[PDB]
Design an enzyme around this catalytic site. Sequence first.
Site, mmCIF file in Angstrom:
data_model
loop_
_atom_site.group_PDB
_atom_site.id
_atom_site.type_symbol
_atom_site.label_atom_id
_atom_site.label_comp_id
_atom_site.label_asym_id
_atom_site.label_seq_id
_atom_site.Cartn_x
_atom_site.Cartn_y
_atom_site.Cartn_z
ATOM 1 N N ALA A 37 0.803 -1.217 0.000
ATOM 2 C CA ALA A 37 0.000 0.000 0.000
ATOM 3 C C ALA A 37 0.840 1.274 0.000
ATOM 4 C CB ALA A 37 -0.935 0.007 1.217
ATOM 5 N N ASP A 38 0.488 2.224 -0.863
ATOM 6 C CA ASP A 38 1.183 3.514 -0.878
ATOM 7 C C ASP A 38 0.250 4.510 -0.173
ATOM 8 O OD1 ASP A 38 -0.829 4.274 -2.653
ATOM 9 O OD2 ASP A 38 0.460 4.148 -4.432
ATOM 10 N N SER A 39 0.612 5.791 -0.149
ATOM 11 C CA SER A 39 -0.207 6.797 0.535
ATOM 12 C C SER A 39 -1.663 6.871 0.078
ATOM 13 C CB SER A 39 0.449 8.178 0.409
ATOM 14 O OG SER A 39 1.706 8.183 1.060
#
Length: 80
Positions: A37-39
Amino acid sequence: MTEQEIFEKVKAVIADKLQVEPEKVTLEARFIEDLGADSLDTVELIMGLEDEFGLEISDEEAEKIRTVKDAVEYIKAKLG
């Protein structure tokens, strides 16, 4: 809801928001280390859980949910 049914719904939300196959969303999976997961994914996942379960997770609480298990346990506690 049973914990199992919560897990199934959480899994669906994660698969959708993080664009990963449902099969990779195991109970101990970490959103960052295991699911990448990224931002953008992080906020989309929290909102996805809020929409799916109709609850409100504070920014503080959200920062503490690192794994699928953390999410399932949090939700099961709130819902009853």
